[PDB]
Design a binder for these strands. Sequence first.
RNA 1: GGAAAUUAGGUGCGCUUGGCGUUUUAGAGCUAGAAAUAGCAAGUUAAAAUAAGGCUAGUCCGUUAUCAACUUGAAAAAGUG
DNA 2: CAATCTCAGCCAAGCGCACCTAATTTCC
DNA 3: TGAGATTG
Length: 1319
Amino acid sequence: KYSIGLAIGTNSVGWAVITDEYKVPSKKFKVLGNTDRHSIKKNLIGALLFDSGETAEATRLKRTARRRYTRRKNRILYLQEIFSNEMAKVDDSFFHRLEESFLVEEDKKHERHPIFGNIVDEVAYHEKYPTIYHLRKKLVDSTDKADLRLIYLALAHMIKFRGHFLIEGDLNPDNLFIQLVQTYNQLFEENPINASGVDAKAILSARLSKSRRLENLIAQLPGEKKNGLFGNLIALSLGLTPNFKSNFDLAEDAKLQLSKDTYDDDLDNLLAQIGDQYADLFLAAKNLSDAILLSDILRVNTEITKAPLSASMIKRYDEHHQDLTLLKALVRQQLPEKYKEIFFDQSKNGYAGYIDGGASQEEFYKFIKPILEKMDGTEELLVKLNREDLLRKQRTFDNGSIPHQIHLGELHAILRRQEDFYPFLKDNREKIEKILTFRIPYYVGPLARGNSRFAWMTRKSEETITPWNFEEVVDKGASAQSFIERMTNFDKNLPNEKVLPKHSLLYEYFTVYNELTKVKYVTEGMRKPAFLSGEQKKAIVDLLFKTNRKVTVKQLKEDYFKKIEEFDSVEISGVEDRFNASLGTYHDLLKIIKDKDFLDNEENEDILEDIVLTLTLFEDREMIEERLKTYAHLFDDKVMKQLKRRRYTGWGRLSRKLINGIRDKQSGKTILDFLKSDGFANRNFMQLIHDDSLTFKEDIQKAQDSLHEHIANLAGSPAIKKGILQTVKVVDELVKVMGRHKPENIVIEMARNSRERMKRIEEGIKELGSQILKEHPVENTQLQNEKLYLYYLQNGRDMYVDQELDINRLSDYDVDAIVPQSFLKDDSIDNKVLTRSDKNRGKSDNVPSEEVVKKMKNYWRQLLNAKLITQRKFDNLTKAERGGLSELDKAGFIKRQLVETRQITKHVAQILDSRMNTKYDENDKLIREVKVITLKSKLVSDFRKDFQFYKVREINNYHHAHDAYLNAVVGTALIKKYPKLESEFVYGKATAKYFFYSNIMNFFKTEITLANGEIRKRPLIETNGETGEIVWDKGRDFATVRKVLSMPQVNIVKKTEVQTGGFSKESILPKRNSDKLIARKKDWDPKKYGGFVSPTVAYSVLVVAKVEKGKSKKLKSVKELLGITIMERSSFEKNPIDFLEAKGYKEVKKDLIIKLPKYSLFELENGRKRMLASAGELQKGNELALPSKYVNFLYLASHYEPEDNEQKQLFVEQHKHYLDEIIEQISEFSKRVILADANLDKVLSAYNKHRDKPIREQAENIIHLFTLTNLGAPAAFKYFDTTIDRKQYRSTKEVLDATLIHQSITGLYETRIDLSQLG
RNA sequence: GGAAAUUAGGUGCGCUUGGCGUUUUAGAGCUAGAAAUAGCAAGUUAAAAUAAGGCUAGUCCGUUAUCAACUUGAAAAAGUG
DNA sequence: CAATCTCAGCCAAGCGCACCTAATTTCC
DNA sequence: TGAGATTG
Ligand SMILES: [K+]
Ligand SMILES: [K+]
Ligand SMILES: [K+]
Ligand SMILES: [K+]
Ligand SMILES: [K+]
Ligand SMILES: [K+]
Ligand SMILES: [K+]
Ligand SMILES: [K+]
Ligand SMILES: [K+]
Ligand SMILES: [K+]
Ligand SMILES: [K+]
Ligand SMILES: [Mg+2]
Ligand SMILES: [Mg+2]
Ligand SMILES: [Mg+2]
């Protein structure tokens, strides 16, 4: 008889076997191999450790980048093939010189000047066109016939770096304010605005923040304020999104943004409230928006050139030239000694490091700003620097905002200019434009032909896909439909039927009637509440749901029960405040098609389901239009135009066949039929499909993956999922260890941004319109501090008092839990706030008091509408106005502290239970031979603290194994003592439940001082009340637990793993002579071209062979560890002997080759162990088994800050000698297996310096000292403020004559190989 | 233990795109001097590569998951204390 | 050799589906 | 945290 405890973590599976006396057995296991040792004794406790499992995300991002480099290359190849025949007439090696431009002169086949093949023409080109943008602008604007090579380069530059696809439709740069002002002045005839003299271009296109230009513009309009109507508008032409609630005395918030696709509908929503007369106001706002949309990137008047982007780059270049000339002149006059540093030293962040070295524009500015402020005549240079507009390059990090339409306009213009001289440019103009503009639709995916596991695209024609034949060769419709249909759920009830669109009319009718049919009403004179009849539900749907998007309970009472039923008073149950379900799509389509009778006519149901399906399935408006054309004769062209813009996303949970297809045989009614009208029973969906007197249940019944696949397909981090599969393998091994007898119980416990924080605070303060970021700028790395993050999330105010907080006094402020942490175990931002003093929350018993909620609710709602708090956080803050925390709330919170509710942990329980329990009884009921028990970590955590079995994670890895053991002990004892708990813990009144779960663990204790101010005593022996069988003996089972935790032999196994992933570090380093550099392409010698460093070793191999020595090349026998790199691995595995001989080995002992992945384990002298870090470095291989008295002493001494504390304090003082004893434990261990005497000397030295320090601080820093002794990779650590750097073991030679240890997953089965016998 | 709806927040898998960076080459450096060097001039741009590569030859695929040893099997797998 | 110093690809956009958690109404 | 290079 035995049980298994398991502790499942992100990097470990702890495990232990226990008997019915809570003991861990030990056993002799066979030892295989070639050593002296035939067997060894092992305790049945241990922990498997592993590197974290990784998600597929990084791999996915690299796969996308590969496709985009492939396709970018093909864009150029398309362009060159078009130019091929005519370029051969001008210069038959021009494309060859382009392709070999990277090669050193000695390697080149053609002359080294790429464009023209000779130095005088090449020099003349750069003199006339210092940047590509000079050429582009020249070719756009000039009427001269141009050299075909210069045409090619300009078009290639645009196609290769073609700009983004975030703006739909066409752009035509044309560089209105007088009219809009005159418009507003007319539409508000009594309150006009005078805009005479206002330079609207200079104010709005200023480089400043949009929030600032609003101020500047309004400053020029006396009588207008920034929050006035015209002020709120200026942001619309600008690009912000403000709310016009107070402008029009509105009741609901209504904002608008021109670039959003919802603009025409929100403007329609707003105009319906404010009146059609306001059409010309937002219309003139939209007209002005066109000419100044691209003013951020186009800084040139579009009347003097058709290439304002290139002209803007040229303006960068010219100002750079002018300002560089000035900067050099000023420096020569005032600071000459700095000239050499600024303009020659590439290692400094001056101009030299900016141009030739590695200084970014940001690092260059910071370096040169104090030099500018120090000198005279640099006022204009300083303004440009602060505008981030000084000595600018033209290829820069901020060019991501250029839309492809801008590059397209210059491309089109060059083609128009030069097609007059080259007929092939006229015949291929649209082809070339297609190369720039064509984008593979994301709903089509990779253009594969049977060899891509990622692709779903299908072809209308079996031929090669180009940008010009894409629409004709690819079946866009089938591919877009496949895109969605491969992913969407089927109806679990009818598993061959796809779920309906979430926005289907039928689906929403289903939702509305399912909710409505369970409403009840009662009025004075009714004996009892009544369901609504079919006729009343139809009246409510027709009168309320089909006239209002949302239906409140007040409208139900006033507009139905008063108006129709003639009730003055009525009590409603089944719905609170408002119905959750609504007919959103009905009202959407009513606005569009303006034909209520059409919507209400049942004969149109198929048409309208197909329309919404098309609007849900497809995202492309032209594909939607194409698919809607069967219905074109039904609607006006104007309606059709609005319908194709009405997109929906999202899928329901149920199919059309289920909700309104299958019929009950006796009645002939569908499910929706019953929801509309079901006598006086009003059965809802759950009742209908479970009712044995209907045929829905049997028809749903008639309509109705390996382990690794199953685990992989679970929701939850790939990290925790790695531990789950290892857990199953640990259990399988332990069962085999136990003679294939199954355990009685298996007890399982499963363990429980900087950029994102800045984005939430930026987006949230922009929503509030607050200037807190301007007053108190922050860096994303700072927002990792809890109190500073809360400060900005609360707009610098107290959450419980209507007052600002002082940002420089956060150490005096409190972080309080909204729901007190004594009830719920939430320490996240969603349950914490920053307040001056937590006493102002109200009482500590509950949620923040009612008075606080009354005062702060409106301020809390503004944070909620800014997403600075979540809805969950708001509901907990305002809970007091809904009764606060009730008695059931408290019981549930204490229950949830005990009973695991996570689905992922239930999945682990289910997996183990279905692997252990496989037999059925006489009633075909499952036979539960093994009870799978799930515990939360708090149970064992409190057990450890209550009975002084303390845990110090930094000492070694044993705490994972000790956890699993205590899980087994506490879990089996718990259900032995209270077998009724099995419903709660085994897979397969309010105050009383509160008191019960608060005291369920009392039976372990002898004397319990209850919270009720009383003390209770229990006997030495705890028993089950029904059976009398002994469960716990406080005179022997606690000592047994001590004998378990103090055992030094714990099977800790670091999972050996082949390394995978990137070939090497990614940086391309410049050329050097060191043979370390790796070629980036087959024929790119790193001595000429640079290359990569640091290949990653996939695994090492032991090689016993011979190598050639000296000029004589005489053969010498060697035994070596060879690191096989990731890049080499396929070639090595394809033919190991041929690979090894190419490396220089001869007469390899083929049968002696040993594959040695990372963490391969070796034992040397005196028990010292090492693991392979690679082929050239080792890791520490031992665990320091510190005695239990020292572990408990460290815990108590390090946590020095009931009246048992005085007893714990006295114990620390009486055992002050343990500190030196622990240092001697570390020293002996380190001298035996660590062998880092310089670091150890530095540690003993540092420990002697601080013997005068308080005991708590010494014990605190002693815990750090175990980094020297820990298993695994060496790592630096600190003792007080003396830093000990790491000692790496950068030689593997010694393991070549050591003992190699192959371990099974538990480490219980070993094969030991004495490598000294090899050679 | 489940289901539908509402509200909100997370996570995973997949697709399509934009901008940098880096590397080598091209962008005639000048004057003095035998040279070492010194005094100046100049600088903003481009091509090409962006896992080596692969066969299945596609505008495809190439970094996730999974892995002690031994044995009988090329392989999948199965067995061994 | 050792001890010590040094280094590490990054920033951004849009879209689809599927899960999970946590509160509310109604049910099985 | 493996490993390239420089300093001792
Ligand atoms: K040559
Ligand atoms: K004003
Ligand atoms: K550089
Ligand atoms: K630079
Ligand atoms: K560049
Ligand atoms: K409601
Ligand atoms: K859609
Ligand atoms: K029509
Ligand atoms: K892997
Ligand atoms: K990895
Ligand atoms: K292993
Ligand atoms: Mg790119
Ligand atoms: Mg390639
Ligand atoms: Mg570049």
